[PDB]
Protein backbone atom coordinates (compact mmCIF):
# COMPACT_ATOMS: atom_id res chain seq x y z
CA UNK A 1 0.00 0.00 0.00
CA UNK A 2 1.01 3.65 0.32
CA UNK A 3 3.11 2.56 3.29
CA UNK A 4 5.07 0.19 1.07
CA UNK A 5 5.91 2.84 -1.52
CA UNK A 6 6.69 5.40 1.19
CA UNK A 7 9.22 3.06 2.77
CA UNK A 8 10.66 2.24 -0.64
CA UNK A 9 11.12 5.93 -1.45
CA UNK A 10 12.70 6.61 1.92
CA UNK A 11 15.15 3.74 1.48
CA UNK A 12 16.02 4.91 -2.02
CA UNK A 13 16.71 8.37 -0.63
CA UNK A 14 18.88 6.85 2.08
CA UNK A 15 20.94 4.94 -0.48
CA UNK A 16 21.22 8.07 -2.60
CA UNK A 17 22.58 10.12 0.29
CA UNK A 18 24.94 7.33 1.33
CA UNK A 19 26.45 7.15 -2.15
CA UNK A 20 26.59 10.94 -2.19
CA UNK A 21 28.61 10.98 1.01
CA UNK A 22 30.84 8.17 -0.24
CA UNK A 23 31.66 9.94 -3.49
CA UNK A 24 32.29 13.19 -1.64
CA UNK A 25 35.32 11.49 -0.09
CA UNK A 26 33.98 10.04 3.14
CA UNK A 27 34.17 6.34 3.99
CA UNK A 28 31.13 4.12 4.44
CA UNK A 29 31.25 0.40 5.17
CA UNK A 30 30.58 -1.86 2.20
CA UNK A 31 27.72 -3.54 4.06
CA UNK A 32 26.09 -0.12 4.33
CA UNK A 33 25.64 0.88 0.68
CA UNK A 34 24.35 -2.55 -0.36
CA UNK A 35 21.96 -2.48 2.59
CA UNK A 36 18.88 -4.15 1.14
CA UNK A 37 15.34 -2.87 1.49
CA UNK A 38 14.08 -5.33 4.10
CA UNK A 39 17.04 -5.17 6.47
CA UNK A 40 16.68 -1.40 6.36
CA UNK A 41 12.97 -1.84 7.08
CA UNK A 42 13.74 -3.91 10.16
CA UNK A 43 16.37 -1.41 11.27
CA UNK A 44 14.16 1.68 10.93
CA UNK A 45 10.53 0.78 10.30
CA UNK A 46 8.75 0.41 13.62
CA UNK A 47 6.06 -2.14 14.47
CA UNK A 48 3.52 0.02 12.63
CA UNK A 49 6.08 0.48 9.85
CA UNK A 50 6.18 4.25 10.24
CA UNK A 51 9.56 5.81 9.39
CA UNK A 52 12.05 6.61 12.14
CA UNK A 53 14.03 9.52 10.75
CA UNK A 54 15.96 10.04 13.98
CA UNK A 55 17.03 6.38 13.91
CA UNK A 56 18.84 6.75 10.58
CA UNK A 57 20.82 9.96 11.01
CA UNK A 58 24.45 8.90 11.20
CA UNK A 59 28.00 10.22 11.05
CA UNK A 60 30.86 9.75 8.61
CA UNK A 61 34.54 10.64 8.43
CA UNK A 62 36.94 11.24 5.55
CA UNK A 63 38.94 8.43 4.03
CA UNK A 64 42.72 8.73 4.32
CA UNK A 65 43.09 9.09 0.56
CA UNK A 66 40.60 11.94 0.37
CA UNK A 67 41.90 13.30 3.67
CA UNK A 68 45.39 13.75 2.27
CA UNK A 69 43.95 14.89 -1.06
CA UNK A 70 41.62 17.48 0.49
CA UNK A 71 42.91 18.73 3.83
CA UNK A 72 39.60 20.56 4.37
CA UNK A 73 37.57 17.33 4.42
CA UNK A 74 36.37 17.45 8.01
CA UNK A 75 33.85 15.32 9.83
CA UNK A 76 30.40 15.06 8.26
CA UNK A 77 27.00 14.62 9.90
CA UNK A 78 23.74 13.75 8.16
CA UNK A 79 20.36 14.13 9.81
CA UNK A 80 16.75 13.72 8.70
CA UNK A 81 14.23 16.28 9.93
CA UNK A 82 11.22 14.74 11.64
CA UNK A 83 9.12 17.88 11.17
CA UNK A 84 7.39 18.19 7.77
CA UNK A 85 8.33 21.89 7.82
CA UNK A 86 11.55 23.41 9.16
CA UNK A 87 11.45 26.54 11.31
CA UNK A 88 13.69 28.83 13.33
CA UNK A 89 13.59 26.55 16.37
CA UNK A 90 14.42 23.49 14.28
CA UNK A 91 17.52 25.00 12.69
CA UNK A 92 18.47 26.57 16.01
CA UNK A 93 18.59 23.25 17.84
CA UNK A 94 20.27 21.60 14.85
CA UNK A 95 22.95 24.30 14.72
CA UNK A 96 23.50 24.01 18.46
CA UNK A 97 24.00 20.26 18.13
CA UNK A 98 26.38 20.72 15.19
CA UNK A 99 28.40 23.38 17.01
CA UNK A 100 28.69 21.47 20.28
CA UNK A 101 29.58 18.38 18.24
CA UNK A 102 32.23 20.30 16.26
CA UNK A 103 31.17 18.90 12.89
CA UNK A 104 32.96 20.45 9.93
CA UNK A 105 30.02 19.69 7.62
CA UNK A 106 26.35 18.99 8.15
CA UNK A 107 23.53 17.81 5.88
CA UNK A 108 19.87 18.45 6.65
CA UNK A 109 17.04 16.57 4.95
CA UNK A 110 13.40 17.61 5.26
CA UNK A 111 10.07 16.44 3.86
CA UNK A 112 7.93 19.29 2.52
CA UNK A 113 9.57 22.72 2.74
CA UNK A 114 11.49 25.17 4.91
CA UNK A 115 10.31 28.59 6.00
CA UNK A 116 12.51 31.31 4.45
CA UNK A 117 13.05 33.01 7.80
CA UNK A 118 14.86 29.93 9.08
CA UNK A 119 16.78 29.63 5.82
CA UNK A 120 18.09 33.15 6.42
CA UNK A 121 20.28 32.13 9.37
CA UNK A 122 21.76 29.13 7.55
CA UNK A 123 24.97 30.97 6.48
CA UNK A 124 25.47 32.24 10.06
CA UNK A 125 26.74 28.91 11.41
CA UNK A 126 30.36 29.64 10.55
CA UNK A 127 32.90 28.20 10.41
CA UNK A 128 30.73 25.12 10.01
CA UNK A 129 28.95 24.56 6.69
CA UNK A 130 25.33 23.40 6.48
CA UNK A 131 23.48 22.12 3.41
CA UNK A 132 19.85 21.14 2.92
CA UNK A 133 18.11 18.76 0.53
CA UNK A 134 14.53 17.70 -0.08
CA UNK A 135 13.82 13.99 0.14
CA UNK A 136 12.17 14.00 -3.28
CA UNK A 137 15.33 15.50 -4.77
CA UNK A 138 17.37 12.53 -3.53
CA UNK A 139 14.99 9.81 -4.70
CA UNK A 140 17.21 9.28 -7.76
CA UNK A 141 20.95 9.87 -7.86
CA UNK A 142 21.48 12.15 -10.84
CA UNK A 143 25.13 11.18 -11.31
CA UNK A 144 23.95 7.76 -12.50
CA UNK A 145 22.10 9.17 -15.51
CA UNK A 146 23.76 8.76 -18.89
CA UNK A 147 23.89 12.40 -19.93
CA UNK A 148 25.70 13.49 -16.77
CA UNK A 149 29.44 12.77 -17.05
CA UNK A 150 31.67 12.21 -14.03
CA UNK A 151 32.67 15.33 -12.09
CA UNK A 152 35.86 15.27 -10.03
CA UNK A 153 36.74 18.05 -7.62
CA UNK A 154 40.34 19.27 -7.64
CA UNK A 155 42.90 20.03 -4.97
CA UNK A 156 44.26 23.55 -4.68
CA UNK A 157 47.59 22.45 -6.12
CA UNK A 158 45.83 20.98 -9.14
CA UNK A 159 43.90 24.21 -9.69
CA UNK A 160 47.03 26.34 -9.43
CA UNK A 161 48.83 24.03 -11.84
CA UNK A 162 45.91 24.28 -14.27
CA UNK A 163 45.82 28.08 -14.20
CA UNK A 164 49.57 28.05 -14.74
CA UNK A 165 49.10 25.66 -17.66
CA UNK A 166 46.59 27.87 -19.45
CA UNK A 167 47.97 31.13 -18.02
CA UNK A 168 44.41 32.02 -17.07
CA UNK A 169 42.70 34.19 -14.52
CA UNK A 170 40.28 32.66 -12.08
CA UNK A 171 37.25 34.19 -13.80
CA UNK A 172 38.18 33.28 -17.38
CA UNK A 173 37.22 29.64 -16.85
CA UNK A 174 33.74 28.35 -17.69
CA UNK A 175 31.40 28.82 -14.74
CA UNK A 176 28.93 26.48 -13.05
CA UNK A 177 26.17 27.78 -10.79
CA UNK A 178 26.59 27.01 -7.11
CA UNK A 179 23.08 25.51 -6.98
CA UNK A 180 23.63 23.33 -10.03
CA UNK A 181 22.19 19.95 -8.94
CA UNK A 182 25.54 18.25 -9.47
CA UNK A 183 27.31 21.06 -7.63
CA UNK A 184 25.16 20.55 -4.55
CA UNK A 185 25.60 16.80 -4.91
CA UNK A 186 29.35 17.39 -4.67
CA UNK A 187 29.03 20.06 -2.00
CA UNK A 188 30.84 22.62 -4.10
CA UNK A 189 31.69 26.10 -2.85
CA UNK A 190 33.17 29.32 -4.16
CA UNK A 191 36.45 29.19 -6.04
CA UNK A 192 36.46 25.41 -6.43
CA UNK A 193 37.15 23.82 -9.82
CA UNK A 194 35.76 20.51 -11.04
CA UNK A 195 37.02 18.31 -13.87
CA UNK A 196 34.72 16.65 -16.40
CA UNK A 197 35.85 13.91 -18.77
CA UNK A 198 33.20 13.86 -21.49
CA UNK A 199 32.48 11.28 -24.16
CA UNK A 200 33.49 12.77 -27.50
CA UNK A 201 32.56 11.67 -30.99
CA UNK A 202 35.61 13.23 -32.69
CA UNK A 203 38.32 12.33 -30.16
CA UNK A 204 36.58 9.87 -27.85
CA UNK A 205 37.44 11.48 -24.51
CA UNK A 206 37.41 15.21 -23.79
CA UNK A 207 38.59 16.60 -20.45
CA UNK A 208 36.78 19.81 -19.51
CA UNK A 209 37.12 21.93 -16.37
CA UNK A 210 34.51 24.17 -14.79
CA UNK A 211 34.84 26.68 -11.96
CA UNK A 212 32.00 27.17 -9.51
CA UNK A 213 30.54 30.28 -7.90
Amino acid sequence: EDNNRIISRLWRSFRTVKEMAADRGYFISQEEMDQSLEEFRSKICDSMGNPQRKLMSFLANPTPEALEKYSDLGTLWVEFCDEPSVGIKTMRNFCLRIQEKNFSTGIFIYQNNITPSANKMIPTVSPAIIETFQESDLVVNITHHELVPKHIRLSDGEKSQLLQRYKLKESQLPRIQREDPVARYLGLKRGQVVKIIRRSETSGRYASYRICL
Binding site: S8, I142, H144, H145, E146, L147, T202
Partner: protein
Amino acid sequence: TPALTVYLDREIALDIEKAKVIQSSIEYTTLKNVTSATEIYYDPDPTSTVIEEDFDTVEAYFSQSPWLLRLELDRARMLDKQLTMNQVADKISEVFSDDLFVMWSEDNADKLIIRCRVIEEDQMLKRIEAHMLDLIALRGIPGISKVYMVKHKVSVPDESGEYKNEELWALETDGINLAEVMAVPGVDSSRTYSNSFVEILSVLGIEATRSSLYKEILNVIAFDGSYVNYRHMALLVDVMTSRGYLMAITRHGINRADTGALMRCSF
Protein backbone atom coordinates in the same frame (compact mmCIF):
# COMPACT_ATOMS: atom_id res chain seq x y z
CA THR B 1 5.36 20.55 -28.08
CA PRO B 2 6.84 19.31 -24.80
CA ALA B 3 7.50 15.59 -24.67
CA LEU B 4 9.32 12.93 -22.67
CA THR B 5 11.16 9.80 -23.80
CA VAL B 6 10.50 7.30 -21.00
CA TYR B 7 12.66 4.19 -21.26
CA LEU B 8 11.56 1.18 -19.23
CA ASP B 9 13.69 -1.38 -17.44
CA ARG B 10 15.16 -4.33 -19.30
CA GLU B 11 12.53 -6.95 -18.51
CA ILE B 12 9.58 -4.55 -18.78
CA ALA B 13 10.74 -3.09 -22.09
CA LEU B 14 10.24 -6.55 -23.63
CA ASP B 15 6.82 -6.93 -21.95
CA ILE B 16 3.63 -5.34 -23.23
CA GLU B 17 1.23 -5.88 -20.33
CA LYS B 18 3.64 -4.56 -17.71
CA ALA B 19 4.10 -1.62 -20.07
CA LYS B 20 0.34 -1.04 -20.05
CA VAL B 21 0.39 -1.21 -16.26
CA ILE B 22 3.14 1.41 -16.09
CA GLN B 23 1.30 3.57 -18.62
CA SER B 24 -1.84 3.42 -16.50
CA SER B 25 0.17 4.33 -13.41
CA ILE B 26 1.85 7.32 -15.05
CA GLU B 27 -1.21 8.69 -16.82
CA TYR B 28 -2.38 11.80 -14.97
CA THR B 29 -6.09 11.00 -14.92
CA THR B 30 -8.46 13.21 -12.93
CA LEU B 31 -12.04 12.68 -11.81
CA LYS B 32 -13.32 15.01 -14.53
CA ASN B 33 -11.97 12.56 -17.11
CA VAL B 34 -14.03 9.74 -15.61
CA THR B 35 -16.86 11.94 -14.29
CA SER B 36 -19.81 12.15 -16.69
CA ALA B 37 -22.57 14.34 -15.24
CA THR B 38 -23.11 16.40 -12.09
CA GLU B 39 -26.35 17.43 -10.40
CA ILE B 40 -27.13 19.28 -7.18
CA TYR B 41 -30.17 17.59 -5.64
CA TYR B 42 -31.59 19.02 -2.43
CA ASP B 43 -32.31 15.75 -0.65
CA PRO B 44 -34.46 16.92 2.28
CA ASP B 45 -33.99 13.74 4.32
CA PRO B 46 -30.41 13.10 5.53
CA THR B 47 -31.58 9.53 6.27
CA SER B 48 -33.20 8.57 2.95
CA THR B 49 -33.65 9.94 -0.57
CA VAL B 50 -36.50 11.20 -2.75
CA ILE B 51 -34.52 10.33 -5.91
CA GLU B 52 -35.54 7.06 -7.55
CA GLU B 53 -32.28 6.92 -9.51
CA ASP B 54 -30.33 5.62 -6.48
CA PHE B 55 -33.26 4.93 -4.14
CA ASP B 56 -32.67 1.17 -4.08
CA THR B 57 -28.91 1.75 -4.06
CA VAL B 58 -29.01 4.13 -1.10
CA GLU B 59 -31.49 1.97 0.81
CA ALA B 60 -29.34 -1.14 0.38
CA TYR B 61 -26.29 0.93 1.35
CA PHE B 62 -27.80 2.28 4.57
CA SER B 63 -27.95 -1.14 6.25
CA GLN B 64 -27.08 18.13 9.53
CA SER B 65 -27.93 20.41 6.63
CA PRO B 66 -30.07 18.42 4.15
CA TRP B 67 -28.03 19.73 1.21
CA LEU B 68 -26.81 16.87 -0.97
CA LEU B 69 -24.40 16.84 -3.91
CA ARG B 70 -24.93 14.22 -6.62
CA LEU B 71 -22.72 13.26 -9.55
CA GLU B 72 -22.48 10.68 -12.33
CA LEU B 73 -19.42 8.66 -13.31
CA ASP B 74 -18.77 7.17 -16.74
CA ARG B 75 -18.29 3.41 -16.47
CA ALA B 76 -16.52 3.29 -19.84
CA ARG B 77 -13.57 5.53 -18.98
CA MET B 78 -13.24 4.21 -15.43
CA LEU B 79 -12.95 0.67 -16.76
CA ASP B 80 -10.60 2.02 -19.43
CA LYS B 81 -8.34 3.20 -16.59
CA GLN B 82 -9.17 -0.06 -14.74
CA LEU B 83 -9.92 1.76 -11.49
CA THR B 84 -13.00 0.82 -9.48
CA MET B 85 -15.39 3.43 -8.15
CA ASN B 86 -14.39 2.56 -4.59
CA GLN B 87 -10.91 4.01 -5.16
CA VAL B 88 -12.44 7.26 -6.42
CA ALA B 89 -14.90 7.44 -3.53
CA ASP B 90 -12.05 6.89 -1.08
CA LYS B 91 -9.80 9.53 -2.63
CA ILE B 92 -12.76 11.93 -2.46
CA SER B 93 -13.24 11.09 1.22
CA GLU B 94 -9.57 11.41 2.22
CA VAL B 95 -9.13 14.70 0.33
CA PHE B 96 -11.72 16.53 2.51
CA SER B 97 -11.84 14.06 5.41
CA ASP B 98 -15.63 13.75 5.76
CA ASP B 99 -16.91 17.26 4.97
CA LEU B 100 -19.37 15.52 2.65
CA PHE B 101 -20.52 12.02 3.51
CA VAL B 102 -19.47 9.77 0.63
CA MET B 103 -21.64 6.95 -0.69
CA TRP B 104 -21.13 4.85 -3.82
CA SER B 105 -23.37 2.68 -5.97
CA GLU B 106 -22.70 -0.88 -7.15
CA ASP B 107 -20.74 -2.12 -10.14
CA ASN B 108 -23.98 -3.31 -11.74
CA ALA B 109 -25.54 0.08 -10.97
CA ASP B 110 -26.87 1.72 -14.12
CA LYS B 111 -25.39 4.96 -12.74
CA LEU B 112 -22.15 4.95 -10.77
CA ILE B 113 -23.38 7.72 -8.48
CA ILE B 114 -21.59 9.27 -5.51
CA ARG B 115 -23.59 11.12 -2.86
CA CYS B 116 -21.83 13.96 -1.05
CA ARG B 117 -23.71 15.61 1.82
CA VAL B 118 -22.77 18.96 3.32
CA ILE B 119 -22.98 18.36 7.06
CA GLU B 120 -25.90 30.94 2.09
CA GLU B 121 -25.31 27.36 0.92
CA ASP B 122 -26.44 26.92 -2.70
CA GLN B 123 -23.49 28.77 -4.24
CA MET B 124 -21.10 27.12 -1.79
CA LEU B 125 -22.20 23.68 -2.99
CA LYS B 126 -21.67 24.51 -6.66
CA ARG B 127 -18.29 26.08 -5.86
CA ILE B 128 -17.26 22.89 -4.07
CA GLU B 129 -18.48 20.87 -7.06
CA ALA B 130 -16.43 22.97 -9.48
CA HIS B 131 -13.47 22.49 -7.13
CA MET B 132 -14.00 18.71 -7.17
CA LEU B 133 -14.14 18.72 -10.96
CA ASP B 134 -10.67 20.29 -11.08
CA LEU B 135 -8.35 19.85 -8.09
CA ILE B 136 -8.87 16.14 -7.32
CA ALA B 137 -6.23 13.87 -8.87
CA LEU B 138 -7.11 10.20 -9.21
CA ARG B 139 -3.66 9.01 -10.29
CA GLY B 140 -0.57 9.79 -12.31
CA ILE B 141 2.14 12.43 -12.14
CA PRO B 142 0.83 16.00 -12.51
CA GLY B 143 1.62 17.62 -15.83
CA ILE B 144 1.43 14.53 -18.06
CA SER B 145 -1.55 14.96 -20.36
CA LYS B 146 -1.18 11.64 -22.18
CA VAL B 147 1.22 8.72 -22.52
CA TYR B 148 1.98 6.82 -25.72
CA MET B 149 3.06 3.20 -26.11
CA VAL B 150 6.01 3.31 -28.52
CA LYS B 151 8.18 0.45 -29.76
CA HIS B 152 11.88 1.26 -30.19
CA LYS B 153 14.58 -0.41 -32.27
CA VAL B 154 18.06 -0.50 -30.73
CA SER B 155 21.35 -2.06 -31.74
CA VAL B 156 22.90 -4.39 -29.17
CA PRO B 157 25.99 -6.63 -29.08
CA ASP B 158 25.22 -10.34 -29.18
CA GLU B 159 26.77 -13.28 -27.35
CA SER B 160 29.27 -13.73 -30.19
CA GLY B 161 29.97 -9.99 -29.95
CA GLU B 162 27.97 -9.36 -33.11
CA TYR B 163 25.37 -6.60 -33.22
CA LYS B 164 21.69 -7.48 -33.49
CA ASN B 165 18.71 -5.18 -33.63
CA GLU B 166 16.23 -5.62 -30.80
CA GLU B 167 12.61 -4.49 -30.78
CA LEU B 168 11.96 -2.82 -27.44
CA TRP B 169 8.95 -1.13 -25.91
CA ALA B 170 9.16 2.40 -24.55
CA LEU B 171 6.90 5.25 -23.47
CA GLU B 172 6.91 8.71 -25.03
CA THR B 173 4.55 11.23 -23.48
CA ASP B 174 3.33 14.81 -23.55
CA GLY B 175 3.84 17.49 -20.93
CA ILE B 176 6.93 17.67 -18.76
CA ASN B 177 7.58 16.62 -15.18
CA LEU B 178 11.09 15.21 -15.09
CA ALA B 179 11.96 14.93 -11.41
CA GLU B 180 8.79 12.96 -10.72
CA VAL B 181 8.67 10.57 -13.68
CA MET B 182 12.36 9.78 -13.28
CA ALA B 183 11.58 8.55 -9.75
CA VAL B 184 8.67 6.29 -10.69
CA PRO B 185 9.38 2.62 -9.91
CA GLY B 186 9.88 0.32 -12.86
CA VAL B 187 11.34 3.08 -15.06
CA ASP B 188 15.01 3.34 -15.92
CA SER B 189 15.96 6.53 -14.09
CA SER B 190 19.33 6.73 -15.86
CA ARG B 191 18.03 7.12 -19.44
CA THR B 192 14.89 9.23 -19.09
CA TYR B 193 15.06 12.11 -21.56
CA SER B 194 13.08 15.31 -22.02
CA ASN B 195 12.89 17.65 -24.99
CA SER B 196 12.78 20.82 -22.83
CA PHE B 197 16.40 21.47 -21.95
CA VAL B 198 15.64 24.08 -19.28
CA GLU B 199 14.28 21.18 -17.26
CA ILE B 200 17.59 19.42 -17.85
CA LEU B 201 19.42 22.44 -16.47
CA SER B 202 17.12 22.49 -13.45
CA VAL B 203 17.45 18.76 -12.72
CA LEU B 204 20.43 17.09 -14.39
CA GLY B 205 22.93 19.92 -13.92
CA ILE B 206 24.62 21.85 -16.72
CA GLU B 207 26.51 19.26 -18.77
CA ALA B 208 23.40 17.16 -19.26
CA THR B 209 21.71 20.27 -20.60
CA ARG B 210 24.64 20.82 -22.96
CA SER B 211 24.44 17.33 -24.43
CA SER B 212 20.66 17.46 -24.68
CA LEU B 213 20.81 20.81 -26.46
CA TYR B 214 23.28 19.40 -28.94
CA LYS B 215 20.93 16.48 -29.50
CA GLU B 216 18.00 18.81 -30.16
CA ILE B 217 19.93 20.93 -32.65
CA LEU B 218 21.22 17.85 -34.45
CA ASN B 219 17.73 16.37 -34.60
CA VAL B 220 16.37 19.55 -36.14
CA ILE B 221 19.12 19.93 -38.73
CA ALA B 222 19.47 16.31 -39.81
CA PHE B 223 15.71 15.91 -40.20
CA ASP B 224 15.53 17.07 -43.82
CA GLY B 225 18.56 14.90 -44.61
CA SER B 226 21.16 17.66 -44.41
CA TYR B 227 24.34 17.08 -42.42
CA VAL B 228 26.58 19.57 -40.62
CA ASN B 229 29.99 18.79 -39.18
CA TYR B 230 29.82 18.16 -35.46
CA ARG B 231 32.34 20.78 -34.39
CA HIS B 232 30.01 23.60 -35.44
CA MET B 233 27.11 22.47 -33.27
CA ALA B 234 29.59 21.78 -30.48
CA LEU B 235 30.93 25.32 -30.63
CA LEU B 236 27.43 26.78 -30.69
CA VAL B 237 26.14 24.80 -27.72
CA ASP B 238 29.30 25.45 -25.73
CA VAL B 239 28.97 29.19 -26.29
CA MET B 240 25.34 29.03 -25.21
CA THR B 241 26.15 27.29 -21.91
CA SER B 242 29.59 28.70 -21.17
CA ARG B 243 28.50 30.83 -18.20
CA GLY B 244 26.72 27.97 -16.45
CA TYR B 245 23.21 29.12 -17.37
CA LEU B 246 21.16 29.07 -20.56
CA MET B 247 22.24 32.23 -22.40
CA ALA B 248 19.49 32.62 -25.00
CA ILE B 249 20.46 34.14 -28.35
CA THR B 250 18.68 37.49 -28.24
CA ARG B 251 19.33 41.07 -27.18
CA HIS B 252 18.60 40.25 -23.54
CA GLY B 253 21.10 37.47 -22.91
CA ILE B 254 23.83 38.65 -25.26
CA ASN B 255 23.80 42.28 -24.10
CA ARG B 256 23.65 41.09 -20.48
CA ALA B 257 27.15 39.71 -21.04
CA ASP B 258 30.23 41.61 -19.90
CA THR B 259 31.78 42.21 -23.33
CA GLY B 260 32.86 45.65 -24.48
CA ALA B 261 30.22 48.36 -24.56
CA LEU B 262 30.90 49.00 -28.24
CA MET B 263 30.39 45.35 -29.19
CA ARG B 264 27.01 45.18 -27.47
CA CYS B 265 25.79 48.58 -28.64
CA SER B 266 26.20 47.57 -32.29
CA PHE B 267 23.82 44.63 -31.78
